[PDB]
């Protein structure tokens with residue numbers, strides 16, 4: 001079934017319940033996921049109204065872009081030309097600059113396919129917005145099916161050569177409560193390398209590092225507490241994880257990562273080359289989620305995209321989008337319950 | 340009473356009814372008015388859903404900007420610097436450029452003051468959008484009260500020196516049917532001069548002309564057909580009216596214009612220096628409004644703002660907005676019944 005309701009500030013809340021009684025909900029404010037629940041328990045972090053997101057934290061669950069991550073000095077080169085983007089974190093451009101696409105009300109259309117329901121969000125980024133060449137016509141289709149598969153499909157077309165590499169910022173917390181650390185979840189990640197950060201500014205350091213056999217090797221399922229208790233300088237730098245991981249094998253068919261807690265597990269599939277993991281290293285912030293004060297490590301992201309830092313490390317990939325080319329991306333979050 | 344419902348594509352429809360039973364409706368898509376009715380009759384032009392606006396014509400009843408009108412070559416000078424803006428009409432920048440503010444979903448909050456209800460819509464124009472320096476935090480408050488006054492209050496603050504001069508693009512049609520021309524309406528307008536257009540491109544000629552005692556002189560009420568039937572060069576150029584008129588006396592207190600049909604009148608008040616008037620010179624386009632094929636001259640706007648062309652005619656004003664300065668503008672459309680005797684035929 002489908003239910004639409006006023007989410008505040010002129011935004012809508014779109015809730016989908018599949019045949020298995022699983023409920024997932026989204027909002028047009030930032031083409032974002034707000035909740036995902038099973039048997040009354042929330043699997044992800046989210047607020048109860050549009051206002052909360054604009055006052056507390058606008059990233060959770062949102063479509064971020066046009067470029068996800070930090071861009072050193074807000075500098076990108078396009079067709080040999082240097083372009084300066086909006087700088088919203090010191091000199092860096094973080095998640096597309098200030099008042100980016102996650103803060104806008106997107107238009108949308110719901111398509112009921114029976115076993116599957118689709119919500120297609122659209123937004124036009126004008127040419128010059130936050131320094132990005134355009135216009136860029138973008139759409140993010142969030143879908144949910146009777147197999148408990150939540151899929152995200154991106155599409156974009158630009159009138160001019162530009163850059164584009166968005167992502168989904170959902171934070172998972174199988175504890176169903178923000179006051180509870182995810183240190184108890186087990187994680188499996190099919191990546192043998194990672195991208196270290198230069199320092200507290202969080203820009204990339206410049207190199208690619210092999211993590212095989214270190215506290216960050218999750219090639220074999222392990223509890224996050226390990227990583228959390230690690231003394232690797234990289235973990236110590238950010239007090240948790242806040243880094244890009246390079247997937248070993250590319251393709252939408254492989255389970256790239258898996259987050260597990262008890263009988264409940266979430267598998268991640270993507271056509272993207274990397275997964276950026278952030279473990280809500282907020283310390284004492286205490287953001288309130290559903291009346292619960294969030295704890296340091298009270299959530300984990302799986303941002304699928306091209307790794308940030310390509311500006312300095314070309315081997316990472318190329319985020320350019322040529323005029324007239326159609327950009328496409330697909331990321332899947334699959335829910336599973338042990339019998 | 341206040342009522343809300345989905346209006347299409349994710350937008351909302353905000354419907355207000357005052358103590359006199361007069362209803363008015365707005366949409367967050369473009370901080371726009373959709374309808375205004377008296378006793379079941381549409382006073383303005385509008386559609387029945389958001390999609391229609393996007394597919395037929397996105398201007399009607401919309402908030403337009405950041406700069407309303409045409410800027411020759413998209414060129415503006417800002418604090419000694421030349422800036423080129425998005426060019427969406429040949430080399431011209433028309434109504435802020437492509438996919439501008441009128442096409443966005445603005446966030447909004449309603450405030451019930453009893454005798455007055457305010458609908459404040461908000462939107463941020465990011466720095467560099469369509470070429471405009473910013474970022475610009477804008478808000479448009481549409482309010483309707485027990486005295487049948489529909490007021491539009493604009494507010495804006497920029498992080499950077501930029502340009503700002505928006506307007507409201509409502510179209511009136513007292514016939515309550517798009518298929519009927521407004522030539523049967525009577526118009527009073529307190530303006531002695533106008534701004535001629537260079538040509539078909541519609542950029543300003545460069546001069547300001549006195550129109551006293553011509554077919555465009557409406558200081559004393561006259562039927563609109565007098566203008567429509569005119570063969571003055573400017574009228575023939577655009578097949579109707581499509582020009583800025585300079586107010587003679589400035590101030591929000593003065594009734595600058597009055598549109599009448601039988602027992603109904605719309606009065607226009609504003610704190611702006613001009614009124615840009617467009618009489619839907621669409622010819623045979625026939626856009627459908629509530630299943631009625633719109634006719635040539637099937638509507639009329641009263642776009643209060645600083646006159647377009649200031650780039651070429653500095654006398655018109657200055658639309659610059661200094662960083663940190665708070666911009667404000669207020670326009671009021673008031674409904675009256677039996678204000679005067681208007682009984683004519685065509």
Ligand SMILES: O[C@@H]1[C@@H](O)[C@@H](O)OC[C@H]1O
Pocket residue numbers: 059202242278
């Ligand atoms: O990596 C980012 C982190 O450092 C913080 O800024 O929140 C958003 C994350 O995606």
Ligand SMILES: O[C@@H]1[C@@H](O)[C@@H](O)OC[C@H]1O
Pocket residue numbers: 398541581617
């Ligand atoms: O003046 C404008 C007219 O010439 C046309 O472009 O439609 C919109 C009006 O605002």
Ligand code: NI
Pocket residue numbers: 005006010011012344345349350351
């Ligand atoms: Ni709504």
